Design an enzyme around this catalytic site. Structure first.
Site, mmCIF file in Angstrom:
data_model
loop_
_atom_site.group_PDB
_atom_site.id
_atom_site.type_symbol
_atom_site.label_atom_id
_atom_site.label_comp_id
_atom_site.label_asym_id
_atom_site.label_seq_id
_atom_site.Cartn_x
_atom_site.Cartn_y
_atom_site.Cartn_z
ATOM 1 N N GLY A 157 0.840 -1.211 0.000
ATOM 2 C CA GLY A 157 0.000 0.000 0.000
ATOM 3 C C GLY A 157 0.863 1.245 0.000
ATOM 4 O O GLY A 157 1.886 1.252 -0.678
ATOM 5 N N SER A 188 5.349 -5.854 -1.777
ATOM 6 C CA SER A 188 5.610 -4.405 -1.964
ATOM 7 C C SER A 188 6.031 -3.804 -0.625
ATOM 8 O O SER A 188 6.981 -4.339 -0.041
ATOM 9 C CB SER A 188 4.393 -3.739 -2.578
ATOM 10 N N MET A 189 5.352 -2.766 -0.131
ATOM 11 C CA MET A 189 5.718 -2.139 1.169
ATOM 12 C C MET A 189 5.635 -3.175 2.286
ATOM 13 O O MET A 189 6.327 -2.990 3.281
ATOM 14 C CB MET A 189 4.811 -0.971 1.552
ATOM 15 N N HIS A 213 8.805 -5.266 -5.887
ATOM 16 C CA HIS A 213 8.587 -4.561 -7.181
ATOM 17 C C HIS A 213 8.794 -3.066 -6.965
ATOM 18 O O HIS A 213 8.898 -2.629 -5.817
ATOM 19 C CB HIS A 213 7.205 -4.906 -7.785
ATOM 20 N N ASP A 245 7.258 -7.258 -11.023
ATOM 21 C CA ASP A 245 6.805 -8.128 -9.926
ATOM 22 C C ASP A 245 7.744 -9.321 -9.849
ATOM 23 O O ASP A 245 7.904 -10.023 -10.838
ATOM 24 C CB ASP A 245 5.375 -8.617 -10.137
#
Ligand SMILES: C[C@H]1C(=O)N(Cc2cccc3ccccc23)C[C@@H]2N(C(=O)NCc3ccc(F)cc3)CCC(=O)N21
Ligand SMILES: C[C@H]1C(=O)N(Cc2cccc3ccccc23)C[C@@H]2N(C(=O)NCc3ccc(F)cc3)CCC(=O)N21
Ligand SMILES: C[C@H]1C(=O)N(Cc2cccc3ccccc23)C[C@@H]2N(C(=O)NCc3ccc(F)cc3)CCC(=O)N21
Ligand SMILES: C[C@H]1C(=O)N(Cc2cccc3ccccc23)C[C@@H]2N(C(=O)NCc3ccc(F)cc3)CCC(=O)N21
Ligand SMILES: C[C@H]1C(=O)N(Cc2cccc3ccccc23)C[C@@H]2N(C(=O)NCc3ccc(F)cc3)CCC(=O)N21
Ligand SMILES: C[C@H]1C(=O)N(Cc2cccc3ccccc23)C[C@@H]2N(C(=O)NCc3ccc(F)cc3)CCC(=O)N21
Ligand SMILES: C[C@H]1C(=O)N(Cc2cccc3ccccc23)C[C@@H]2N(C(=O)NCc3ccc(F)cc3)CCC(=O)N21
Ligand SMILES: C[C@H]1C(=O)N(Cc2cccc3ccccc23)C[C@@H]2N(C(=O)NCc3ccc(F)cc3)CCC(=O)N21
Lengths: 177, 179, 179, 179, 179, 179, 179, 179, 178
Positions: free
Chosen positions: F56, F85-86, F110, F159
């Site tokens: 997010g 991700s985060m 990513h 990704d």
């Protein structure tokens, strides 16, 4: 197919009422009746009716134009004549109102709506009741049935066969093949 | 739609009428007009009604049916692709001995569909009307197929898919047009 | 669409019919009318059916298929861009020795798609009908390709993309038209 | 769209075809018809394909590509405004020595886009198909530009915007048309 | 949801965890928290995981799976109503000898579902990832059922509905809990 | 969410914080508050941050990251289900030697996503900002993993899905917690 | 929903469970939990399942059905208002001699509903599954009513509305509770 | 909305049940629960059912009606504002001599409303069911009012609005409660 | 809404708030509060505070009849606005105990509604709303001292009154001055 087929039939004094009756359809039919009277004030017109009905005022534009012009307007029901459709079927020249054997005729009371203040609802109710009295009186004259019988028989949706429509006086003959 | 006349108008000049869509009042009124026009052009020569239709309005179908029986020319019927519901009714309504299907065409028969909303007595009127409509369709299909009313009732209770050959055995058509 | 006649009407004058969209009843009825018109103009000269189509209605496809087999002229088929599903079925339906694809044209074969909602017995009727439809398509594809029914069943279980050359090896076409 | 014939039909009379929109099946079928018609009018005189297009369907683009390579006349290509994606592919597909851009025209190259939904094995089939499509586009672009497959793959990994002069250095066109 | 504690909190006091919905991150995080809490209360007594689930997120399912294998207590699994997809995976993940279904419970196994949109290389990454996810699920199902990887692959190609008794024969559960 | 305290509040009493959703400002503010509260309760005892998150907001993630590094207690990280991700950035941000994943947990890395609309100079400002954000994330990931900035840049271009074991080889975690 | 405990929780304290809505997984999971809780409170005393339901999910209904048959207490069933479809199935599932309806309550039986879309083989799998589900429902209804499987099949082909007295004659209930 | 217990729960403590909305399954289930609870608290003391309702579901109404007749306490009915359709049916269902309306309250009686779509035989089943439902309502209204079935049929053909005094003359209530 | 919530604390002092559009839910809440307050004490005044644009006539009559039915006097106080059925209920308070604050607005007008379907259905709906209007006007006549004919004329369209004009009209007994 494309004269388009409707324009070729109009050349033989055949008018198609083959949809819901709104102002556009009524204005087209009124124009065709006036045009055919101008072409020949003596020869029969053939109004073929396959309609579920629609606007009462639009229906009366057609009705009054039929009675106004000099030619007899024969009416022929194919498929269905419901509501204002059956009113116009019954409005054809005396002795020249027909249905094909499997055509359906439906008669019922007028539909409408009213929103707003009590006095606006009162005005709308008085108007639709006067409209119903007018429709029923003319149907009485054209069928030979009493006003009381037409009122009772139109209280709800009333479906007739071609043969029953003839017994009722809505048409003069079933066109057999 | 290509030009030569659009293609449909050129076929109409050879007494070929296309019923190639759902049957509504507009389609029925077009077909009725074409039948009347073709009778006026020549009251003796056959008309060719080609049918690829999933069916539609019963009253619109009866506008076409009664106009076929009314006019003097024989109306041949040819099923290409599919004749379902009122489409298969009109296929069966062609002149006796001149109802055809191409070999891979599908025929489907089933009972009429409809709706009713409102007061109990309004629902009763709508139910009586659609049951009378079904009796009328079944009686005519009995006369045109040679099947009993009881067999047509049972066979139309649900969607009933026939091959061209089965449609011929049923009496909905007279012949499969082989190449 | 430019004018010279619109361009499609000019091609129709040279016995070229375009199947350049999804196959529905309207497209099928247009193609059927064009085939009948061209047969009436000349019962001996070849017709050219050019196919760029993702497929569509099986019954609409069979209206086209049966009309091709019915008429006297050979109907050549030429795949330009893509022939998928019923599109590839109609490509395979052209006159023997006159089914073509351009070198980069794509051919895709797969099983028929559909839907069913309602009661268990309605779902059963819809399932039986689509399985019979698949048997019918596979039988005809077997006859037109020379492949066994069992191979066609296995090869259409999922989306199966072929090059023009692979379509020729499969027997869906007779030749790749090279420049 | 003005009249003189609409303006596009008047240009078609001088063997000028406009590809001035997104490439879909309708646009491709129109362009294919125009190419076939112009070859029938004169199999020797050049055709002029003018391109202002953001691209679109790969299979529709290949309908145009294969029809260009099939016909006998040279098809010149002229980029005016923008040739992106399949648009730039078709710009590169013109007759050798007759591929042009006006000085401020933009060319964009990138890899094909798509989607895939459903079971793992359906996603695998869709992935294999779009990768084979990319290999096919890249191989032909290699042949038409003189660039290696490895360079085309790297240069199309993301949106890659070229000036007319850069498109010429790349081998997508032969000349910048100076006034 | 009635009170006595809400009913689910009263069952949790007796080491009963409900998996009674689609598996998403929120449901998985709730189940993981309940497993950790119950282990902290008593590291020796059985936990009862009751499953009525159509499945859902594979990663959420693996949060639950790994937390079950991580903690010291045996986690019994009981299928009531339905265990489909990741639901049936978690049913098979219960302690050996303590995986149950009630007699009319349904078990369904099938391959993972997903999607991918964008560039060819993005679709390739998404396809590789979902195929690796399927290999991972099938390997663990092989270990927990005793079936070969090849049989699990074939049997999950399409939706495969099992009765409680068939799930037991397959090795997805140890016993049908009869009344 | 069941009661024993709701289940999350009972875990917080044992210094366990759940990051079990998409990271937005609300989730970040909740996690920051929990970290500050736990430091005030006991500045020496470990905190356990359990991560099942698709990622997010980068700035929300950095609120959590900086609060972790700010407080005196070690914050262990445990990946259960997925850290993307985060989410994977925060997994890597746990105390050195106390970053874990369960065996079937997934990690994805990513580059950051965003948007920009308006005038050329506004798009330039938004592009410069997201490139600086990526340099900042890659530098910190380099420090936490031991990988070079150049390797992180290449490996996050698209990704990139990792198993628990691959995340450990990468230096995103210290150990796979085996059962 | 009023308080005294909310009214439903107060009735649960007297071993009364309300099934007063459409049957979905949430309702089934609530009813299953209530049955298990009541068995734990007292394994001997009757439970009262009051039913006013139009039906719903078959698998959710079977979660309730199997939990009723599993637990030791008799579960009385009382139909108030309507028990349709899975609702009438659960009414018939009450302890022998303790299935009731109030005099004006309605019972409706009919076949299961569903849908299927996709490939022919997917539609076939969905059709086989819903036919097997119907055989399972009809077998259990046969055992609980004393009617033959063939009679239940015929009587559930379409919506079949019964009065309380007719439900008793059918064997769906044991008695009409008269005032 | 207001608390003292919410206001409705405080009135329930004095054996007052408020029916102030459309009758659906949720409202009926709440009213049935309140009637059963009040009977359990005291089988002899009157219950006061206050009615301001436009009506709603007939089966939901019959859940309430049968529960009233089932329990031992007399249920007084008091109409305030409006009792229309099933609302007026339940007003008439109160204990003999204890059915009231306040002076300006309206009572409306009319025939049941519904709908039906699908096959002719489905419409027939729906029509037969709603006609039987109307016969059932009219028979009970005859018994409770002292009017003949024929008079009730005629008087409910359309919306029939009654003053409190007219409802008393009709036998729908016993007294107008004057202040 | 601050904390008992504030409305529940006012109810403890026999103050009922009618502060929204009148529908069945609001009427059922107000009726329940009136019945509850009568059960707590059958003799002490109730205070019905009205800030309402009106709403359902039948819902309004549920409130009206419950006011007249119970033994305690129900004072009415208009704060902000009492329109349509709101102003009807303001006028329905115990004789001598109907108030408005000085800047409160009162609006009176005829009932609104709708009718769809067959001519005879439209006739039934029209007759019913005209009878409803006669009933409202008769009660307003009794409570204000104005003739039925004056109320009919004055409600033909939206008629806005100041607090002072509402008092002159007989819709309230006093303006509560500070
Ligand atoms: C009778 C008189 C008249 O009152 N009208 C008004 C009128 C307008 C539209 C619709 C009508 C329908 C019913 C009755 C009057 C209608 C037009 C008419 N005219 C004609 O009828 N002209 C022949 C004509 C008709 C149609 C057509 F296409 C060509 C000529 C022009 C000369 C004229 O004096 N009149
Ligand atoms: C048979 C008789 C008749 O009752 N009608 C009424 C009629 C109207 C609309 C639809 C109908 C459908 C089925 C049956 C009758 C229908 C029209 C017909 N006419 C013609 O057929 N005229 C040649 C004609 C038709 C079409 C055409 F394009 C050109 C000429 C005019 C002369 C005439 O007496 N008739
Ligand atoms: C080559 C052969 C053939 O295979 N086709 C099929 C075809 C269809 C659509 C696109 C195609 C693209 C590339 C290759 C074939 C294509 C049509 C062609 N014909 C002509 O070219 N005829 C002159 C002509 C064309 C168009 C026109 F408007 C006027 C004349 C008819 C005579 C014939 O044998 N052929
Ligand atoms: C073969 C026979 C027949 O059964 N039909 C029915 C028919 C109708 C619609 C589509 C069909 C598709 C496939 C097969 C039959 C189809 C029409 C045909 N006719 C012609 O082919 N006529 C030349 C023709 C066609 C088009 C045109 F513009 C001019 C002439 C009229 C004379 C005739 O007996 N026949
Ligand atoms: C095993 C170790 C650890 O790695 N974690 C991390 C963790 C966090 C969130 C979910 C997880 C799921 C699976 C596996 C680890 C998970 C928490 C655990 N702790 C406890 O289990 N504490 C008793 C406890 C649990 C729950 C509860 F409500 C009260 C006490 C705190 C002390 C400790 O070292 N550990
Ligand atoms: C470290 C210092 C400080 O700068 N802040 C500001 C601050 C505010 C909001 C979020 C922050 C996040 C990261 C870092 C500082 C943050 C709060 C902290 N305080 C405490 O930690 N107080 C015990 C405490 C905390 C939470 C709790 F629930 C109970 C006690 C008050 C005493 C103090 O000097 N500090
Ligand atoms: C008469 C018999 C029975 O058949 N039922 C089933 C039932 C369930 C739901 C609604 C119903 C409505 C009408 C008629 C039966 C209904 C429940 C009832 N019970 C009680 O009435 N128990 C006192 C009680 C109820 C509620 C409460 F909160 C406390 C005590 C439990 C003991 C018992 O044998 N019975
Ligand atoms: C029979 C066995 C078991 O397999 N389960 C799984 C299960 C879970 C949910 C619903 C089920 C319905 C039918 C059959 C099994 C069900 C739970 C059950 N337990 C209890 O019944 N425990 C007393 C209990 C229940 C509820 C409550 F609130 C308090 C105590 C825990 C102890 C135990 O061994 N078991």
């Amino acid at each position: 197919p494309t004269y388009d087929i409707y324009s070729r039939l109009l050349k033989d004094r055949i008018i198609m009422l083959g949809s819901q009756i709104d102002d556009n359809v009524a204005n087209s039919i009124v124009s065709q009746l006036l045009f055919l009277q101008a072409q020949d004030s003596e020869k029969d017109i053939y109004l073929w009716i396959n309609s579920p009905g629609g606007s009462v005022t639009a229906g009366f534009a057609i009705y009054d134009t039929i009675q106004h012009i000099k030619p007899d307007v024969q009416t022929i029901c194919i498929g269905m004549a419901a509501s204002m459709g059956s009113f116009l079927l019954a409005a054809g020249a005396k002795g020249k109102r027909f249905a094909l054997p499997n055509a359906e005729v439906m008669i019922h009371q007028p539909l409408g709506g009213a929103q707003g203040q009590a006095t606006e609802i009162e005005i709308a109710a008085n108007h639709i009741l006067k409209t119903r009295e007018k429709l029923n009186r003319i149907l009485s004259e054209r069928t030979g049935q009493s006003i009381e019988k037409i009122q009772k028989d139109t209280d709800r949706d009333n479906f007739l066969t071609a043969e029953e429509a003839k017994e009722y006086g809505l048409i003069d003959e079933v066109m057999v093949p």
